[PDB]
Short mmCIF file of C-alpha atoms in Angstrom, two decimals:
data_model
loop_
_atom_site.label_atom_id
_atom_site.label_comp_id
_atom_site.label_asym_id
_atom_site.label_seq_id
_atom_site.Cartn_x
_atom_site.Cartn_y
_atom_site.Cartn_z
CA UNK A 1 -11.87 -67.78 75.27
CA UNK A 2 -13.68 -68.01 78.66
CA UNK A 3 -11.81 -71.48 79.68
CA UNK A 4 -10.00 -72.66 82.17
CA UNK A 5 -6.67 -73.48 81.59
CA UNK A 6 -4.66 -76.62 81.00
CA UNK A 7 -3.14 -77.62 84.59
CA UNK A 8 -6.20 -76.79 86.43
CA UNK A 9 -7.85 -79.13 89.01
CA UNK A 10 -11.30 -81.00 90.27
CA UNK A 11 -9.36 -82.98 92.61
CA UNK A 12 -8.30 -86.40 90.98
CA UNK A 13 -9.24 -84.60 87.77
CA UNK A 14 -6.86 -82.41 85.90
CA UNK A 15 -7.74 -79.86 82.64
CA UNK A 16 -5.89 -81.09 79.88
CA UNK A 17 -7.58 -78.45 76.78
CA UNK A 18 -10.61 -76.92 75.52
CA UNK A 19 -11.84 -78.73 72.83
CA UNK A 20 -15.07 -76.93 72.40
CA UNK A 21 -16.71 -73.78 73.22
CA UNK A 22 -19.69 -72.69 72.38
CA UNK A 23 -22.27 -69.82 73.64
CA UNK A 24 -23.91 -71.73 76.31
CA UNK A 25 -20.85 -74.36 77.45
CA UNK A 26 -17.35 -75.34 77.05
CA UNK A 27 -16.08 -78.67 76.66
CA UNK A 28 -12.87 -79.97 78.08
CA UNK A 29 -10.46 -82.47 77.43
CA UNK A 30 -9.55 -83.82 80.82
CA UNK A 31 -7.53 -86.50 83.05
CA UNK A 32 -9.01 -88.39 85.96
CA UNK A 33 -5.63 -89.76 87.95
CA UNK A 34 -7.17 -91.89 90.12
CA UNK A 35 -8.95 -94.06 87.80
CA UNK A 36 -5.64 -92.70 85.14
CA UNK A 37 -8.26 -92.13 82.01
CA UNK A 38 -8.90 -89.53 79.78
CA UNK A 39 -12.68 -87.77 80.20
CA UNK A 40 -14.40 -85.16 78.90
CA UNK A 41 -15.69 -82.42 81.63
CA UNK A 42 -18.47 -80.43 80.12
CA UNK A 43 -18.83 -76.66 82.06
CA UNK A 44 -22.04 -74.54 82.18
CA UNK A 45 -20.67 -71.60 80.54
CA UNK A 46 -23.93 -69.28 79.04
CA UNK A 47 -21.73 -66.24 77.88
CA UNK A 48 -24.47 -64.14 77.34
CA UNK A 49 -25.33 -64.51 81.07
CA UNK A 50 -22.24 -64.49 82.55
CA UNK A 51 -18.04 -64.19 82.83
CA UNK A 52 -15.25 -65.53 83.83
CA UNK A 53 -13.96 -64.20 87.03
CA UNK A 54 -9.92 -63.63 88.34
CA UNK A 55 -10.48 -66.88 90.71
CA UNK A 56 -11.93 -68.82 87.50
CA UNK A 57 -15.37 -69.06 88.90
CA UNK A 58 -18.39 -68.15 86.88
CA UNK A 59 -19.86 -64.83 88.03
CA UNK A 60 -23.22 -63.37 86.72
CA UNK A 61 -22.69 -60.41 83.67
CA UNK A 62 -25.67 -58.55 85.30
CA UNK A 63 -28.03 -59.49 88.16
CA UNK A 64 -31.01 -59.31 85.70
CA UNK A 65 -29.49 -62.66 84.93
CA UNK A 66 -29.80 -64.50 87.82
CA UNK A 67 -33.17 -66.41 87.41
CA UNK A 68 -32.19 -67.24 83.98
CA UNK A 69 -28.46 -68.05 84.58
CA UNK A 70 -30.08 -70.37 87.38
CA UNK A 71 -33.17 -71.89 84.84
CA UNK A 72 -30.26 -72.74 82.45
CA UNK A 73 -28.61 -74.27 85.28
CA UNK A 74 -31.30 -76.31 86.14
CA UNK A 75 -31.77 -77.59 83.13
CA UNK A 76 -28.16 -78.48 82.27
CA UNK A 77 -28.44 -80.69 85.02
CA UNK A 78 -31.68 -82.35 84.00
CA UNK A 79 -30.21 -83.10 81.47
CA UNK A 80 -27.40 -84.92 83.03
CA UNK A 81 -29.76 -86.93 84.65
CA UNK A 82 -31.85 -87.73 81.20
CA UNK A 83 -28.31 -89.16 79.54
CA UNK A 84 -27.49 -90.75 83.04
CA UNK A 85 -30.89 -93.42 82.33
CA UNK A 86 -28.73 -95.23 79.54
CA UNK A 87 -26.00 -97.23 78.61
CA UNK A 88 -25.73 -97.06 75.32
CA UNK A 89 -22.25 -97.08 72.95
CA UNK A 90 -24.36 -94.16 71.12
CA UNK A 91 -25.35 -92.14 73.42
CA UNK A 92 -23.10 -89.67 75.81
CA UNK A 93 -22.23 -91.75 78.84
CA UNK A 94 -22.03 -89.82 82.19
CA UNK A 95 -19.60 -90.53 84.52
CA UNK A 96 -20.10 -87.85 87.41
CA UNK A 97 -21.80 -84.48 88.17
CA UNK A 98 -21.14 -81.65 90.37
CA UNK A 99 -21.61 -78.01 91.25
CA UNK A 100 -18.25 -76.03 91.65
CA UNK A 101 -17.23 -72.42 90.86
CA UNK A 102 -20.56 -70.99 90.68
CA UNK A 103 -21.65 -73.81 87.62
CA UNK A 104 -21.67 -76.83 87.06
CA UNK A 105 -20.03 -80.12 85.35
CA UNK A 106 -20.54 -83.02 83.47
CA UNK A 107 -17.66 -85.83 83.69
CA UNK A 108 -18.24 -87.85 80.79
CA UNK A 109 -16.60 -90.36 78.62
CA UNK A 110 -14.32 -88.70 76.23
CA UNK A 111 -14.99 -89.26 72.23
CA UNK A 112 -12.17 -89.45 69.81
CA UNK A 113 -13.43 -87.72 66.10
CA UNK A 114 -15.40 -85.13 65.54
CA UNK A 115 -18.72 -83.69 65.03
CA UNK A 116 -20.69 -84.68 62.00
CA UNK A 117 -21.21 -80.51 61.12
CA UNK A 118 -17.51 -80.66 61.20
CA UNK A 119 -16.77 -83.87 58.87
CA UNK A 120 -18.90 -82.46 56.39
CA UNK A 121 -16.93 -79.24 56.29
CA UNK A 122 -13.75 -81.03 56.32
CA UNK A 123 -14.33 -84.30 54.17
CA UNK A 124 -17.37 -83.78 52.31
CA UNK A 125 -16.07 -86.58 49.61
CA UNK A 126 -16.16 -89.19 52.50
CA UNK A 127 -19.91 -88.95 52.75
CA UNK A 128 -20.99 -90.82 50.54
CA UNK A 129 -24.34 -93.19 50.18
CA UNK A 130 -22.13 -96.52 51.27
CA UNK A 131 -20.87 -94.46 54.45
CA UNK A 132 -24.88 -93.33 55.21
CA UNK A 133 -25.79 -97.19 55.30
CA UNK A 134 -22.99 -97.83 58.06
CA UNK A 135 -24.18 -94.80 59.90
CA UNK A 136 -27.31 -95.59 60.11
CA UNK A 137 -27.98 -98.68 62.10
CA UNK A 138 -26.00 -97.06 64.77
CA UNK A 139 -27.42 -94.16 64.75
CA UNK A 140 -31.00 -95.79 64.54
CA UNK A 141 -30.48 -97.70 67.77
CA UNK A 142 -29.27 -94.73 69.90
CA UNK A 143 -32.48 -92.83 68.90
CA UNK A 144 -34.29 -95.68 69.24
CA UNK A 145 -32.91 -96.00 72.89
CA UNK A 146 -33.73 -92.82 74.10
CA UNK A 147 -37.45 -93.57 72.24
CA UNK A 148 -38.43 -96.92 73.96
CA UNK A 149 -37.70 -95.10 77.73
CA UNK A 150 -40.39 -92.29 77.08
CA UNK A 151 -38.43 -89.79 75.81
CA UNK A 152 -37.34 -88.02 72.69
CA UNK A 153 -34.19 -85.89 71.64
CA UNK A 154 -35.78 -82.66 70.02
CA UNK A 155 -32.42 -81.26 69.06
CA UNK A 156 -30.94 -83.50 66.62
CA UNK A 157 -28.67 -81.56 63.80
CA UNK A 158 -24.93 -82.21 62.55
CA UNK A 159 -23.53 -80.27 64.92
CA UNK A 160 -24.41 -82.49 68.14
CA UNK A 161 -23.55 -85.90 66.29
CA UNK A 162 -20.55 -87.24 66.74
CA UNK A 163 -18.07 -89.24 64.59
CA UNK A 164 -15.43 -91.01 66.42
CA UNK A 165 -12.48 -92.12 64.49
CA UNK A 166 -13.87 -95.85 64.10
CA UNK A 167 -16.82 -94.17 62.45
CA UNK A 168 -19.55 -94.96 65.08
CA UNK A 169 -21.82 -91.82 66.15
CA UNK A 170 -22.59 -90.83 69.88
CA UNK A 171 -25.41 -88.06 70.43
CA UNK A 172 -23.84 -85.90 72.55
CA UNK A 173 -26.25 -83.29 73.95
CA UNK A 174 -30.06 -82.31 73.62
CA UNK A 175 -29.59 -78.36 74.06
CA UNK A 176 -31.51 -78.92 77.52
CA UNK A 177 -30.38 -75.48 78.67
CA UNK A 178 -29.63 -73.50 75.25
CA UNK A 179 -33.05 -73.58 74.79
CA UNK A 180 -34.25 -72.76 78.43
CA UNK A 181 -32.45 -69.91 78.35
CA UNK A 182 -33.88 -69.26 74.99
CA UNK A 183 -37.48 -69.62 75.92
CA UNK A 184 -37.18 -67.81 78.82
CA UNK A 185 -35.33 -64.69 77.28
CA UNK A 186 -37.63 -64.58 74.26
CA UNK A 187 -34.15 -65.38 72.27
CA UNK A 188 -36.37 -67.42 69.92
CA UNK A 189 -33.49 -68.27 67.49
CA UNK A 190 -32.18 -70.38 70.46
CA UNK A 191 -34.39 -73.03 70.49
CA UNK A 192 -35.13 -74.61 67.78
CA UNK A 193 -33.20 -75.42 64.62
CA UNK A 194 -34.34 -74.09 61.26
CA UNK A 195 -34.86 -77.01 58.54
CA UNK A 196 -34.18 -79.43 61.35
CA UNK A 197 -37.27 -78.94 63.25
CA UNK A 198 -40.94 -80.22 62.14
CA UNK A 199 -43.80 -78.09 62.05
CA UNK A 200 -45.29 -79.76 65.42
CA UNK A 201 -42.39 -78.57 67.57
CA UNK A 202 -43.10 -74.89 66.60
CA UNK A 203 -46.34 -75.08 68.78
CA UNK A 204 -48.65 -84.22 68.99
CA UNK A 205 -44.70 -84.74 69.50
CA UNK A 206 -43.53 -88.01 69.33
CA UNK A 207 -40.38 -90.57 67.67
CA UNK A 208 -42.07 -88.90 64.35
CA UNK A 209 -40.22 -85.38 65.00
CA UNK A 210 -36.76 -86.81 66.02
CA UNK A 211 -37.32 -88.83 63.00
CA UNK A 212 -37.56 -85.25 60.62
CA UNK A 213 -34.59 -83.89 62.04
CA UNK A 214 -33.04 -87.03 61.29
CA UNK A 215 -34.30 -87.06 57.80
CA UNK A 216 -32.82 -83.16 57.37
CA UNK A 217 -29.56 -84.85 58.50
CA UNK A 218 -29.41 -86.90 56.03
CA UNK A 219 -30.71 -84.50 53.29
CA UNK A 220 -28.04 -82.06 54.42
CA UNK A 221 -25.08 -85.19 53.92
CA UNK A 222 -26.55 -85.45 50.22
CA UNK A 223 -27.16 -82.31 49.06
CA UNK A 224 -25.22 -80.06 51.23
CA UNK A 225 -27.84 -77.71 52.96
CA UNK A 226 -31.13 -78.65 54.93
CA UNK A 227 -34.74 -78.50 53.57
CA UNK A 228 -36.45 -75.61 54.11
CA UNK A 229 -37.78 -74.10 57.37
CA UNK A 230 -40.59 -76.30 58.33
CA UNK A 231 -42.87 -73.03 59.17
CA UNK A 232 -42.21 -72.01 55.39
CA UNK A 233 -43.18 -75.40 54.46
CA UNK A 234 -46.78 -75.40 56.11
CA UNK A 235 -47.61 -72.17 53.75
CA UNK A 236 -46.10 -73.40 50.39
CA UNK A 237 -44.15 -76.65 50.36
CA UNK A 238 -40.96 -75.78 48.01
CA UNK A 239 -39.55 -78.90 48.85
CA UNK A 240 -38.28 -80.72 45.94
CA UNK A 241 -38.27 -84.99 46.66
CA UNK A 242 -34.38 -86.39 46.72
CA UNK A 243 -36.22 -88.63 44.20
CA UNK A 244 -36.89 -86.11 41.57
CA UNK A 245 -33.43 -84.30 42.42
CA UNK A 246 -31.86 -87.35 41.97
CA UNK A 247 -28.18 -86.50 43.35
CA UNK A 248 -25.47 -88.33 41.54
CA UNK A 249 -24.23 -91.92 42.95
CA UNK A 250 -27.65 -92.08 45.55
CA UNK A 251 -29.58 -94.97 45.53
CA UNK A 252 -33.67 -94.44 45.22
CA UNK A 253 -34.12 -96.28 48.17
CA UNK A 254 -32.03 -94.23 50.79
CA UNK A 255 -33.60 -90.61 48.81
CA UNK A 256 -37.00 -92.00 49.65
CA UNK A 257 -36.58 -92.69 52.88
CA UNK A 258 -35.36 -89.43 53.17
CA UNK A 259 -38.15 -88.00 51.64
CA UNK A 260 -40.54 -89.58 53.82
CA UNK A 261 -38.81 -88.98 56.51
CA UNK A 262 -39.35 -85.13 55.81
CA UNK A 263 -43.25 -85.49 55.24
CA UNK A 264 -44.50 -82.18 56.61
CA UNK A 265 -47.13 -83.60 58.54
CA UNK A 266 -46.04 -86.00 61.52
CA UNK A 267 -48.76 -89.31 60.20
CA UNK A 268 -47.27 -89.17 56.73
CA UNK A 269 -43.77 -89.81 58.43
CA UNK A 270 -42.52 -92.97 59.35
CA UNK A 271 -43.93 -93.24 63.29
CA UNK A 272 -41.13 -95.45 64.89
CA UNK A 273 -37.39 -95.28 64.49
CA UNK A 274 -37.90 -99.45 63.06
CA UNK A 275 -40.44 -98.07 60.72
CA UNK A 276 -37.87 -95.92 59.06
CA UNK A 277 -35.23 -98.58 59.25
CA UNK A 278 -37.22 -100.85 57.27
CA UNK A 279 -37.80 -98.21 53.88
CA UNK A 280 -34.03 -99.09 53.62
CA UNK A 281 -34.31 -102.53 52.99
#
């Protein structure tokens, strides 16, 4: 681990644990004792790029690095300021940001639960098609949220869902500066998700191609593994239609809506996040 330890200090804030770390950040459980509540700090960490140094700052792995470490940067901020726009129960909620120790941080609200890649590992038998329908509405409006401002998500998969222990979902991160660091390093399998992103986002974006990832969501909570790579698709569609696969105890309704949710080409999709919402009922 490349974290800083529990007992360390921003201030008012204190490091209680690191509760995630991936390649490109690490996530904190932390304490803010002047307001005396719990946060989560979120640390630009790309380990590829750089290393922890004896004073706990961040120091560059090679200077090669340095207009990538700083794109990444950049972006890991922008995207601060993207979640910063809302005020959503579903979506991250940002507290504060700053620049420290040769990164930077994200002071957020802090999440109880778990990640939805991780609840399907864990407690695959509590997904079932009754849990989906209370999912989705939820889910649905945060989307929707970050939709009707202009924007989309482009990153949506299991692993950056989360489920708190009341069951509601937050999105928690758009991989903003995973995949500028991928672009710009020609790490290709950095950027986009395979099975979770449509054929338009491999080179006409809209709510239609947040809407496919969230349909490969929902295939992979019913089946157990996304649809196939979207690329592969385009050539020779192997898909087979939840319909005709017909997974025990799932409705027809929610496996169509799937299913058209995954249409390969974006007009054949549902176009809004409503749009979708209504093939439920």
């Amino acid at each position: 681990s490349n974290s800083l330890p529990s007992g360390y200090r921003f201030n008012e804030f204190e490091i209680q644990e690191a509760i995630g770390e991936g390649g490109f950040g690490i996530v904190y459980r932390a304490y803010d004792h002047q307001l005396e509540r719990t946060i989560a700090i979120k640390e630009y960490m790309p380990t590829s790029l750089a290393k922890r140094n004896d004073d706990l700052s961040i120091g560059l792995r090679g200077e090669r690095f340095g207009k990538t470490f700083q794109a990444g940067l950049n972006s890991f901020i922008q995207e601060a300021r993207l979640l910063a726009r809302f005020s959503h129960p579903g979506l991250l909620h940002v507290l504060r940001f700053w620049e420290e120790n040769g990164t930077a941080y994200m002071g957020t609200q802090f999440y109880s639960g778990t990640t939805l890649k991780n609840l399907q590992a864990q407690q695959p038998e509590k997904i079932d098609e009754a849990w989906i329908r209370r999912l989705l509405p939820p889910l649905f409006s945060a989307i929707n949220t970050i939709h009707q401002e202009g924007y989309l998500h482009r990153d949506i998969s299991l692993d950056n869902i989360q489920i708190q222990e009341s069951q509601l979902p937050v999105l928690l991160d758009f991989g903003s500066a995973r995949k500028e660091i991928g672009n710009l390093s020609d790490e290709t399998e950095i950027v986009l998700k395979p099975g979770f992103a449509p054929i338009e986002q491999y080179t006409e974006q809209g709510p239609w191609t947040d809407i496919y990832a969230l349909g490969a969501v929902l295939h992979t909570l019913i089946v157990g593994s996304p649809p196939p790579v979207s690329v592969v698709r385009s050539i020779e569609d192997s898909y087979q239609p939840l319909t005709e696969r017909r997974p025990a105890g799932y409705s027809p309704e929610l496996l169509r809506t799937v299913d058209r949710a995954l249409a390969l080409k974006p007009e054949d999709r549902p176009q809004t996040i409503d749009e979708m919402a209504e093939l439920l009922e």
